[model samples]
Target: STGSATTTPIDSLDDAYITPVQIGTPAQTLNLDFDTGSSDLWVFSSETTASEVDGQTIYTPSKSTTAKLLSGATWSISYGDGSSSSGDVYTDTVSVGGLTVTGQAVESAKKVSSSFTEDSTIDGLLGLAFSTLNTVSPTQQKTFFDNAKASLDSPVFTADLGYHAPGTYNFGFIDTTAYTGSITYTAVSTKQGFWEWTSTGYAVGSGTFKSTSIDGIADTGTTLLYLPATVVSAYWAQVSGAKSSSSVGGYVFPCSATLPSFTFGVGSARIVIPGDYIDFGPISTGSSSCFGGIQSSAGIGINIFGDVALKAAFVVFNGATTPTLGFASK
Candidate 1:
């Protein structure tokens, strides 16, 4: 079975993207953040305390006849910024696009961090990462993509995120018309439960391809492209006034500074991130300095090809016996 869904970036800065998902028999529709960096498909539910609910939608398991608690199963996860959420688990009917998964594990949030509660646009998160990363106890549950793989004609899914426009995610099939040119395939390493791969190299604007292999993870949940400090510093040097500012939180330049395009290679195929995308936005609502989208991966331990880079290409995550990744310019 092949299925597709549209995703729209939420907030003015495109901090994250959200897509609608149907859960349970009665079909309660909720907008969820699809995260390739995580493996726990969790949602805010009736179990959540009233104070933590905020303005986000809630899933009422009691209202869904298909919902059943997974005895003794619980989960908890903490974000990079120290934000966290923990909850009990349940099995229910979950649907993405036209695809359906029976008895899919849905972790119902008993509590959430201030960041989650404050962001009212997203009701939950649908993790598409490897099942090994799932936090469910006593039973390590499969991700939605993993469970849906058996029914899909092809064990693959695609992510086409947009800059300020709408994008699409597809399962089981590739839409050739959605992308231009040809797709370039690469090897993937999920040793740490991530869709890890290597970019052949990178170039600043129309400069050299550099030829150095860069190991990174393609994470849709993250918002920025984090690469080696040397490369990032080189990229900013091309900008007249760009500088690394601890108080500003990252590389920030004058809003009027010229930004050169960033190009990364997938094997021999190249994907170019537009210059405007890197300028990001102002450091603050009224600040004259703008933050950079591509920055140093120093101290983070791993380079992350986040939305900043993914939005520049159509990415394929193939879950074959030997997993692989494909990139195409869109």
Candidate 2:
């Protein structure tokens, strides 16, 4: 009735969380990004170019007899970083945690290239967002969650991310032991096919909650918390030695600087992120200057409460007729 998977971060920056998934008939375990920001169960597979294989584990559909080619079905997606992938689709047995779902559409990446850079650790992505965001064409398909929802004990999932440590993603039901206190529920605006919601307001440390509604998405695929430029600037202003530096990657300060906590609200529920989490490691290897996890999304066009904020709490993604997001302290 329910399933659970562990997610581990690859690097010191905690760039992306990867979950081990069981795919195919005999089950080939591939570590994938259980991304909530986008919908496309794309992976580096046997079809992927050798030159593009940067230390990633490739999934071989031919190895499993249960796999079938989805005729004329193709998909492509462009990452916000400008990186893109295109591939052919196939149907195969897919399993996460212990929940096995037959005939799951799996996009095999035939081409992969990036502009900013490439991660050697991320082998693929298992999308957890709405099916509406899926990129499959000619024949739209449902996501792993969608296909398995009917058999699931409940139409719900939860993300409990960690700070450079392993976390858990529970499906079908909430693990009350995974969180403390009661969850604060908020309506999710999914017209855009994302777990999108607006926050009541935010405060810097112990400051009073500023009355403002900030529309942002809870993105586990993203590493940093992106806010409006004004809010970002105001946050950096509070720190004595902190300064904004686009060249060095936004808001850098001495590693030893006294940092303050950040608090945001889901209705009246306050999720306070520790100052230590804000110090997102050093700017470079052996560098004394560190960057802030909270940056400006000026050019990105949208605010994102990424893993930096999400890891601070236990979040529930309710996929009922009316979608809602639940937040609780852990």
Candidate 3:
């Protein structure tokens, strides 16, 4: 069976340890977060001390025997979360799950944001989203996928989610348990970054979104699922006797016992958001109501899939091997 995909908050990123990933022929392991949002594998370094990198993990070339730095290439990234970093570029051997890859572009940040520094539990982020949104390209810069794509089995990646249950975050290989039946799947638009797409709408249980669906994107980087307000209201309307909380960002219903099985459509792939996800409730800040699971991106390309959807299925991140994503039962 696959492990749980529950989001148990950790006080420090160090405690949220990930297995090391090596790049290139010889390999060097880099710590990172399993983010399904953006496409691009990046790492931090001791040089990033210029910013708020206090307790964050920074990679140092000297420590790696196989690491190689690019002459003058440099990069700076600013996340939507308001966190940012700047660093030099390099190539080296990278490894994870005993997989050895070569010529991987690694970022050695000289400046890091306080938000990343303050999170003791967050190390670096890994791009397990989709190939469409990759940092590497024939026209632009080549990312990890550019180097490792040849090695992946299906050129695919998968995520297996569950809550605090001992082994929630399983990676690398897909477990047979989750693949009992032929899985329903969808083709992603060959757009850019994080395999983002336009979601039609959300349906729960046997319910379907006739004409109320909207177009949006799915992201693993976001902790919560950000939905359109009108779409949220429309979906919630279907639930009988479920009352809205005091203006929370996420949705909660008094019919906790009767929690509706929420479903969203991506082509023919109908995804179900489990009831426990709804039970997690919301997190209120100031006067804003925020569901612990869902939030609003308002339009402007702010929509995301968030952790809410990931917890429902197993995700296979193929970037370590190829430019593909694989899904199955665990």
Best by TM-score: 1
Candidate 3 lDDT over 153-189, as tens digits, reads 4344455545433223443345567644445454354
Q: What is the TM-score of each candidate against the true structure?
A: 0.98, 0.97, 0.75
Off by over 4 Å in 3: 1-19, 22-30, 129-140, 166-174, 198-200, 205-214, 236-259, 266-269, 279-290, 300-302, 316-330
**Of 2 and 3, which scores higher on lDDT?**
2
By lDDT, the best candidate is: 1
Which residues of candidate 1, in runs, are more than 4 Å off?
none
RMSD of each: 0.9, 1.4, 5.4
lDDT of 2 at 138: 88
Q: Which of the two candidates, 1 or 2, achieves a greater lDDT against the reference?
A: 1
Q: What ordering of candidates by lDDT runs from best to worst?
A: 1, 2, 3
User: Measured by C-alpha RMSD in angstroms, how accurate is candidate 3?
Assistant: 5.4
Q: Please provide, for model 1 over 1-330, each residue's C-alpha lDDT reduced to its tens digit, 9 standing for 90 to 100.
A: 988999999876778999999999899998999999899999999999789988999999999999999999999998655678999999999988899999999999999999999999999899988999999998899999999998899999999998889899999999999899999999999899999999999999989888989999999998999999999998999998899999877899999887899999899889999898886788878989999999899988999999999999999999998999999998
